[PDB]
Design a protein around this ligand. Structure first.
Ligand SMILES: Cn1c2cc([S@@](C)=O)ccc2c2cnn(Cc3cccc(N)c3)c(=O)c21
Ligand SMILES: Cn1c2cc([S@@](C)=O)ccc2c2cnn(Cc3cccc(N)c3)c(=O)c21
Ligand SMILES: O=C([O-])C(=O)[O-]
Ligand SMILES: O=C([O-])C(=O)[O-]
Ligand SMILES: O=C([O-])C(=O)[O-]
Ligand SMILES: [Mg+2]
Ligand SMILES: [Mg+2]
Ligand SMILES: [Mg+2]
Ligand code: NA
Ligand code: NA
Ligand code: NA
Lengths: 519, 519, 519
C-alpha cells in the first residue's frame, strides 16, 4: 500500500483521496499516457530520434503547416530508421507511430521587407492597414500588413478584433474598405513573417479541406502514416470530407479531429461520432474563445471522449518554457498532471521538441509527470462511474473486457495481457481505465503503432512464426508478453497477471480471461 | 428492462429504486434462496416428500428436540427414497441436503396429569409453584409445575420472569426456596406438557453440548448428514466442542451456529469465525431478548455473514399462520421478502411443514416470495459495497470469481456456470451476490447437497464417466450445465452465459472465465 | 455514539450500517411513527380509550364497513371524552385524530341460515351455486351462496376465481348462467355470514362512491372528523368525487386514498397527485394481486409518497396473531420494523384493537418496534437522496426547513420546534426525515390532530392567551415547546434544539431558524 498511491487509492471520498496523496509513494515503472512529439529542426536527425524514442516518444507528429513533401518524406524516413534500429530485440522494441497534422483553414501574413528574419515594431495606438494586394505580400511593415485570406472584409466589421502570432498582437478594425481594413494596434509587439491570424467571432468561410490539404492527405496515404490530426474541424461533414480523401486505400488510417474554434466545441457531439478521436488543440482554441474558458472545453471534451471510449489528446504549450529552459515552470508541471488526471489518452509537445533547445528533457518531463499523475487517479470512483455509464449488451467481448479490468483491480495485477489483431480487444480494456498496464500482443505492425492513441496500451510486435496448432500459437504470444513485462520491469516471476485471449483465430472472438502467475 | 425489476435496477439512488418497483415486472424462472423444511408428521411420508421437493424444498431439517434415533433414521430413509426417485434424469435432478438440528441446552416442563393431550388453565394473578421433585414430573397442574433444569434456583431471583411455551405464558418469581420457586402468573393461558421454558437475563449454566447432543451428533455422522444446526451457541468454544464431537469422520459436515440468546449476539464475531454458517433462530431469540429488538439482531447477523462470505439462515414463524390456513398473513409475506432483501442465503419453515395442514402451500409460498424479492435487490449498490469491503489479494481464484460476477452484470447473463469439486469456487461467486443463477457442476454428491447453503447456487450432479483428456471432460461438464439451464428455463440457445473452469484437475485451480453463447 | 444506533448511523456504506446495528444501543424516548387504531367492541369504552391513548394511539379509525351512524357517533363521543380527560395539562396533552374509513365498493355475502353465528362447512371439490335471488339473502348454506353484487355475471367467466372471507375460501366458476354461477370449492373451510368477496382480474363496475358512502362522508363532515380513508380508489376522478362530497364545509378534511386493487397500483401517480395521502391497504390488495407481490407495491408506494412529501400509512395484519395472543410472531415484529424502515409515516391496527383480546399490548408493541426501527434508519443516505431529489426553488420556507434539518443532524438536536398555524411549516420539515422529533406548536386544534399523519411530528396545542407583541407571543409558544420536550423526556436543560419561526403573524411566513440551548 506504500507504493503507487495505494493508500490514497483506498480512500472512500475524493477529499480523503486528495489528503492521502504522498510525494514519497513511488509509482510503478509503466507510464500509460502516450507522448506525441512534433518533429522539426531540433529533433529530425536519426541520432536525435533514437534518443527521443529512448526518452519516451510514442508518436512523431509532422506539422504540414510548414515544409515541403520532400522535407516531410525525409523526416518520415529518419523516424523509421531510428525506430527500426531497435527491432533486433522484439522484447524491448517500442513501436512508433507517424501522425500527419494538416495545415487546414489557417490565415497567414506575408513577409516583412522580403526577409525571413526581419521584424517590425507595432506600437500600441498606432494605425496598421491590412491589405489583400499581392504587390505587398513580401513588403509587410509597421504601416501595411498583407494576409492570404481574400474574403476577410466580408466576415469582419468595425470593432472586430484581429489577433496575430499566437494571439500576442491584437488589432481592432477602425475602418473597413471593399478590400482593405484600417486597424489600430491594441496589444503591440514585434511582428515577424508568415504569422498566424485569428478572427474570433467571425464566420471564416475557408474550406475545411483545401487543395493543399488534399495533396497532403494523399501524400500521407502514400507514406503509410498511422493517423491524421485534422485542423479546425467544425462539423461532421468536415470529418466525412477527410475520410473521403483518405478513401479506400487510407480506410485504416485514424482520423483525429482537432477542436480549435467555437463551432467545433458547439458541434462536438457530431464531430466525435464521425471521428476516431479528438485533439483539444488549445493554441488556436484559446484565441478563438476567451483564454479563461479553455479549461472548461478541455474537461468537457476529455469527459465526453472517455464516456464514448474514443482517444483524446491534450495539446499545445504544455511545457512551453522548455523551448529555452532545461526545467519547466510550476504551471507547466501542473498542466501535464491535470491533463492526465482529467483523462487524456495522450499528451503532446510542439515547439518544445520541434525547435527548442531541450527536446529530450521535455519528453523526459512529460514521461515523469504522466507516470506520477497516473498513480494519483481516483480509480475507485472512476471505474464505478465508467461501469454505470456503460450499456448492458449481449457483446461477449465487452463483458470479457470489463471482467478483466475488475479482476485486475482485485489482485492488483502487474498487467492485463491482450492478444489482438485489429487492436479492438485492447481498446475495449483501455476504455475502463485499469491501473495495470495493458500489454497488447499483435503481429500487425499498424495495429501496434496505432495502439499508442489509447491510455495504458503497451503494444508489442510479435515476430515469431505462427505455430500450426492455435493453442500453441496463443501460448507463444502470451509467453512473449510475459517476457516483455519481466524485461521492462512491469512484473516478476510469481506475480499475478490477467490474460485475455479468443476461442479461434481472427478478429472479434476475445472471450477468455485467465488469472495466471508469471513464469 | 421490463422483466426482473430491471427498470428499478438502473436507478442511481435507493429511493428511486424503491419508486420503480413494479408488480407487473415478471421475475426470472430461477429462485436463488435455499428453502429449508422441518420434517414431521405432516411431511415424512415418501409421497409427501416427493411433492415437497417438487414444491421447492432444498434441505430437510430433522429436529432432535423430539423423536428417537429410530424415528429420525426412518425420516432420513424416506427423504433419500424421495430424492433418489428423480435421479434417473440428471438434467432435472435436484440434490436435497439433510440437516440435523440439535436439542441443545433447552429447559422443558413435565407432563400434565400423566397425559400428552391434557391441559390446565393458568389464570392471571394466580400462584404457581415450580418444583424440581421428580415425584411431580408427570403430575403437573395449575398449582405445581415441574421442570428439568435442576439448577434453576441458583440463576433466578425474586422478580425474575419465566416464560413458558414460545413465551406465551409469563410468570414472575415471587418467592425463592432452596429447590423450588413460588411464582405469580402474569400472562395466562392453557399449559400443555413438555413445553419450552426461557429465563431471560439469567446465566443458565447448562452445557452447550450435553450427553444427548453427543449421541445425536455421532448419530448424524453415522447417518451421513450434510450439516448440523447447533442450538444455543454462546461462544467460540461451544462451536469447537461440536467440531470435536463430529471429529475426523465428520470433518466435512458443515456447522451452522444457531444464535438464540443475548450472549450469542454479544459474542457473534467469534462464533462466526469458528462456524461454517449462522442461523438467526428467532423463536428463542425473541423471548431471550425483547421482541422489538429481533429485527436489529437479524439485520446485524445477515450483514456480518454477507461481509464474511458465510451462509446465513433466517428462521422461525416466517409463515406461521399457514399451520392452519392455506394463505399467509400480509406480515408473513413481508417477512419472507425482507429476509431475502436483507441478504439471507436460506429461509426456513418449522411447524408450517412439520405438523401443519398446508405444508406444500407453505413451501410454494416461500419459493414465490423469494423469487420476487431476489429481483428487487438493489444490486447496483450491493455489488459496489461488496467489492469495496473485499481485500486486495494475490488469490487468483477470487479475482476470477469477481471478474465473472462483473461480466455477468455487463451482459445480463442467463447463468454463471462453475465447475467445482469441493464447492469452494461456486461459494466464491455466490459471495458477490450476482443476479444470475450459479449452476455449480460437481461429481461429488455431498458438495451438491451442501451448495444449497449459499444464495444462488443451483447444484447439479454430473453422472457421466470421466473423459481421459481433461479438456474434453471440462467440455462435457459445461455441456451438461447448458442442458440443465435450457431444461429448467434459465436460458435458451443464443443467450450469453459466463463459464468458470480451472487449468488442471483437482481443487483450487479455478482461473478461467469465458463468455460463451448457449448452444 | 452508544445510544440511538449512532455507531451504525456513522457507517459510510449500507452494508456496514447493517453490521453495526446493536441490540444494546438504546433508542431516544420519542417515537415518531403515528399509530392508527381501529375502534370496536374491544376498545370503544371511555376507560379503554384512555388506556389506548396512554399506550400510544394517535388516530382512532372508524370502520364504516360495519355499524350504524348512531353507533359511530357514540364511538366518536367516547374518543373525545377520553382525549379531553387529559386536556387540563397542556404540557402532556396528546391530540387524538378521528379518521372515517369508507365501506366503498365492497362485495358481501348474505346470512347463513338466518343467524349471525351460524357457519357451514365448504369441502374442497364440492359444488357451490352463487345466486343473486334475494329470497336466499338470509338462507345461505353449503349449496347456495347469495351475494350483493348484482352485476357479477357480467364481469366473471368460466375459470374465474372468487375469494371469500379475507381470501381464505377460494372458488372457481365452472358454469355461468344469466344471473347465477356454479362454482367448485378449491380451498375450503368454514363459511360465515356477511363475508367479503374479491374477484381478482375482474373489472368490477361498482361506483367508487356509493349512496351509502355519500351519507357516511356527509356524516363525517357533521361529526368534524380529521380525515377520510377512502376505500378502493382506482383513479384520480374517484378522489375528486370524494373531494366534491366533502365540499366547502369539509375542505380541510384530509383525503387518504386506500390502494387495494391492481388499477389503484397502475394509476398510483394520478391518485397520489389528487390525494392528501395514501394507505397501502394490504388486506384486499393481497387478494386482488398475488400475495407474493404485495411487498413490491408497498415499497413502491412508500417510496413515491416520501418522494412527493405526502403521508403514507401501512395497514392490515401487522400484528394479526395478537387478536388471540399477548405477544406477536417474529414475522409480525419484522413487518412493523420494515414498514418504518421503508418510510411509512403511520402504521395501523385493525382487528388487533377493534375486537382482539389484547388491544393495549398490540398498541404498546407497535410503539416499541417503531421506536427501535426509527433509530435504525440509515439517515446518512436517506437525507442525501431526499436533498438531491428536491427541486431548487425560490420558496424561502422550504430553504428554511431543509436548513433546520441539516442543522439538527450537525448538533444531534433534542428536537426541531416549529410554530405552525395550518401545519404546513411542520410538514415541510418532516418531509426531510430528521432523526430529531419535531415539536409542532399550534393554537389550531384540527392542525394538531392532523399532524399525526406525518412521521416525527409531535403536535402540541397551546392554550395560552395571545400576547399583544408578536415577539413575546412567539417566545411564549417556544417556551411552551421547551416545557413539553423537558416533560416528555426528549431533552433537558443545556441541550441544543432547533427553533423555526416566522417574521410576522399568519400562515406562510416561516423564515427563521435558531439554534438555542434549552432553558
Ligand atoms: C476531480 N474529481 C474526481 C476525479 C476522479 S478520477 C477522474 O481521478 C474521480 C472523482 C472525482 C471527483 C469528485 N468530486 N469532486 C469534488 C470535490 C470533492 C471533495 C474535494 C474536492 N476538492 C472536490 C472532484 O473534484 C472530483
Ligand atoms: C435497504 N437499503 C438498501 C438495500 C440495498 S441491497 C441490500 O438491496 C442496497 C442499498 C440500500 C440502502 C441505502 N440507503 N437506505 C436508506 C434509504 C434511502 C432512501 C430511501 C429509503 N427509504 C431509505 C436504505 O434503506 C437502503
Ligand atoms: O493546432 C493546434 O494544435 C493548436 O492550435 O493548438
Ligand atoms: O431454535 C430455533 O430455530 C428457534 O428458537 O427459532
Ligand atoms: O381496507 C383495508 O384496509 C384493507 O383491505 O387492508
Ligand atoms: Mg491550431
Ligand atoms: Mg431455538
Ligand atoms: Mg380493504
Ligand atoms: Na473487484
Ligand atoms: Na460491469
Ligand atoms: Na450537517
Amino acid at each position: 500500500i506504500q507504493t503507487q498511491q495505494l493508500h490514497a487509492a483506498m480512500a472512500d471520498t475524493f477529499l480523503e483521496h486528495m489528503c492521502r496523496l504522498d510525494i514519497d509513494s513511488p509509482p510503478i515503472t509503466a507510464r500509460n499516457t502516450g507522448i506525441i512529439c512534433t518533429i522539426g529542426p531540433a529533433s529530425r536527425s536519426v541520432e536525435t530520434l533514437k534518443e527521443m524514442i529512448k526518452s519516451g516518444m510514442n508518436v512523431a507528429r509532422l506539422n504540414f503547416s510548414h515544409g515541403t513533401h520532400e522535407y516531410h518524406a525525409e523526416t518520415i524516413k529518419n523516424v523509421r530508421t531510428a525506430t527500426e534500429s531497435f527491432a533486433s530485440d522484439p522484447i524491448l522494441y517500442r513501436p512508433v507511430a507517424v501522425a500527419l497534422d494538416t495545415k487546414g483553414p489557417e490565415i497567414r501574413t506575408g513577409l516583412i521587407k522580403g526577409s525571413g528574419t526581419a521584424e517590425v515594431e507595432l506600437k500600441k495606438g498606432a494605425t496598421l492597414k491590412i491589405t489583400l494586394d499581392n504587390a505587398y505580400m513580401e513588403k509587410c511593415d509597421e504601416n501595411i500588413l498583407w494576409l492570404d485570406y481574400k474574403n476577410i472584409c466580408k466576415v469582419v466589421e468595425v470593432g472586430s478584433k484581429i489577433y496575430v502570432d499566437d494571439g500576442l498582437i491584437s488589432l481592432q478594425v477602425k475602418q473597413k474598405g471593399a478590400d482593405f481594413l484600417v486597424t489600430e494596434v491594441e496589444n503591440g509587439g514585434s511582428l515577424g513573417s508568415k504569422k498566424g491570424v485569428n478572427l474570433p467571432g467571425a464566420a471564416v468561410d475557408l474550406p475545411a479541406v483545401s487543395e493543399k490539404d488534399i495533396q497532403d492527405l494523399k501524400f500521407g496515404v502514400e507514406q503509410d502514416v498511422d493517423m491524421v490530426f485534422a485542423s479546425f474541424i467544425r462539423k461532421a461533414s468536415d470529418v466525412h470530407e477527410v475520410r473521403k480523401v483518405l478513401g479506400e486505400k487510407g480506410k485504416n488510417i485514424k482520423i483525429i479531429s482537432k477542436i480549435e474554434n467555437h463551432e467545433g466545441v458547439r458541434r462536438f457531439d457530431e464531430i466525435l461520432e464521425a471521428s476516431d478521436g479528438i485533439m483539444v488543440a488549445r493554441g488556436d482554441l484559446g484565441i478563438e474563445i476567451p483564454a479563461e474558458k479553455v479549461f472548461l472545453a478541455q474537461k468537457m471534451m476529455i469527459g465526453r471522449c472517455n464516456r464514448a471510449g474514443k482517444p483524446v489528446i491534450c495539446a499545445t504549450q504544455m511545457l512551453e518554457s522548455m523551448i529555452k529552459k532545461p526545467r519547466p515552470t510550476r504551471a507547466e508541471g501542473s498542466d501535464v498532471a491535470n491533463a492526465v488526471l482529467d483523462g487524456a489518452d495522450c499528451i503532446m509537445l510542439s515547439g518544445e521538441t520541434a525547435k527548442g533547445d531541450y527536446p529530450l528533457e521535455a519528453v523526459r518531463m512529460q514521461h515523469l509527470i504522466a507516470r506520477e499523475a497516473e498513480a494519483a487517479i481516483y480509480h475507485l470512483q472512476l471505474f464505478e462511474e465508467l461501469r454505470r455509464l456503460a450499456p448492458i449488451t449481449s457483446d461477449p467481448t465487452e463483458a470479457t473486457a470489463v471482467g478483466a479490468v475488475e479482476a485486475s483491480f482485485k489482485c492488483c495485477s502487474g498487467a492485463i495481457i491482450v492478444l489482438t489483431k485489429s487492436g479492438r480487444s485492447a481498446h475495449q480494456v483501455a476504455r475502463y481505465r485499469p491501473r495495470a498496464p495493458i500489454i497488447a500482443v499483435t503481429r500487425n505492425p499498424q495495429t501496434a503503432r496505432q495502439a499508442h492513441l489509447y491510455r495504458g496500451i503497451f503494444p508489442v510486435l510479435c515476430k515469431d512464426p505462427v505455430q500450426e496448432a492455435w493453442a500453441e500459437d496463443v501460448d507463444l504470444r502470451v509467453n512473449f508478453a510475459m517476457n516483455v513485462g519481466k524485461a521492462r520491469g512491469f512484473f516478476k516471476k510469481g506475480d499475478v497477471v490477467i490474460v485475455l485471449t479468443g476461442w479461434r483465430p481472427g478478429s472479434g472472438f476475445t472471450n477468455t480471461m485467465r488469472v495466471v502467475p508469471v513464469p
